[PDB]
Amino acid sequence: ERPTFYRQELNKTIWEVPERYQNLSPVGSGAYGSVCAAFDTKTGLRVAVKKLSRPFQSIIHAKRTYRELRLLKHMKHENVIGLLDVFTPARSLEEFNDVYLVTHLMGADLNNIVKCQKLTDDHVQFLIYQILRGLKYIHSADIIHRDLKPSNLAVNEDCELKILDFGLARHTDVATRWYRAPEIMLNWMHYNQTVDIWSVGCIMAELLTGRTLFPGTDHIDQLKLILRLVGTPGAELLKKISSESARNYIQSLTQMPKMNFANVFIGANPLAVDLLEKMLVLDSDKRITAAQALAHAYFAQYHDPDDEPVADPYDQSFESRDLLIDEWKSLTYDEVISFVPPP
Ligand SMILES: Cc1ccc(C(=O)NC2CC2)cc1-c1ccc2c(-c3ccccc3C)nncc2c1
Structure with a gap:
């Protein structure tokens, strides 16, 4: 089922995340993008949520977004940052304009x-x-x-x-x-x-x-x-x-x-x-x-x-394809709703 989201202004933008993530709080860095420390009551872990900045503003960003997401979902090692989750407030591709990432927090x-x-x-x-x-x-x-x-x-x-x-x-x-x-x-x-x-x-x-x-x-x-x-x-x-x-x-x-x-x-x-x-x-x-x-x-x-x-072999084959701004966007969507949280 689709979780229940809430809203608040963190780092000067609308943050719409699922209720599992509580107590969002900016890190003070900025060098990693827009990122907050949060508590995930689903896993019970301290997490780090990062709202992607206008992820699809152009081919460079589009492909860059899908690229990072591909990398994050592929990497599963205790000494590499990985994806505990990834979510979007959107209910359908039509809307989809922001990507949110979640990982373990270090601080x-x-x-x-x-x-x-x-x-x-x-x-x-x-x-x-x-x-x-x-x-x-x-x-x-x-x-x-x-x-x-x-x-x-x-x-x-x-x-x-x-x-x-x-x-x-x-x-x-x-x-x-x-x-x-x-x-x-x-x-x-x-x-x-x-x-x-x-x-x-x-x-x-x-x-x-x-x-x-x-x-x-x-x-x-x-x-x-x-x-x-x-x-x-x-x-x-x-x-x-x-x-x-x-x-x-x-x-x-x-x-x-x-x-x-x-x-x-x-x-x-x-x-x-x-x-x-x-x-x-x-x-x-x-x-x-x-x-x-x-x-x-x-x-x-x-x-x-x-x-x-x-690691398993990384299927880097997308790095040569030339795609439209909308296609890179769609693949990032596919990568988001096909996502499966780790155990
Ligand atoms: C959320 C996020 C998403 C993706 C990638 C990433 O490397 N993506 C590349 C494709 C691999 C990195 C982060 C990131 C940034 C800062 C983090 C801090 C943190 C908090 C405060 C001050 C300093 C740090 C480092 N603490 N815990 C985890 C952190 C994780």
Whole structure:
């Protein structure tokens, strides 16, 4: 049966949600869209409801909406945000103009944690572990995050973590680059899933040291900052950059050796430093994977091959179809009423 909705103004718009969701309350962030913390009396969980902004204003948004929804309904892992529900006040396609999403709530993100807790070695392991485990899931479904960062890691009171914003296209017109992998920033050859490991590395290094590893100002400064630690590229990596300008420009810079991670991260679990040198490598191909990373002896106290699941193949076949603004809209509708809540 169709539930009974109610109305109220939150974040300057009409919010019409089913009565199971009570005590809606804005998060204060805004960086994640329009989102409220709520209590779901159906599951009895604390949830996070997000009202999609004019989801179908144009092909770009239309397809973007269906894309996110597809991703959310497909992902079912304890370290990745997933769909507890999705609903619309509309009774028929005709109406349909808004999409509402629901997920578990955490209330905070990594970014807003270095400024608080002092972070012991132990908690760092737990946090990096969850990112790698969730990453392994995501990667198995052939989905790349591409822009992983501390602000995309939703963490709750008990340092439990969920990865957010995965697989969402690119940017329009900017974007922080303090964690993006160099392969991406200078746009080189085909780039594998390992781009995310580069990011995990930056984060891990940040959690260990309390300061941002590569807080560059603009594009060349970032590259300056990274090459000063991992060193400039040899002929092996240069030859693989099946690019042009980027290759000729990269090699223009002054050659530099890789620093000694051991003395860069003064005082830090040695096993931690070992992992960083395996993640922060210029060459993605020679960079460690999430699965490999979960076996490293640093995560000794948490590793458990049986409890580190994989995803089913993600049917990404819609990413090539050219559709009308109304068709992308309709598919998002189909995806909404065919939805089935998890157990
Ligand atoms: C609702 C929603 C829908 C979809 C996706 C998403 O990543 N979609 C991409 C396609 C994958 C993300 C969210 C999202 C945003 C902020 C959340 C906060 C939260 C609350 C306050 C301050 C900071 C945070 C992080 N706490 N718990 C869960 C949260 C979930």
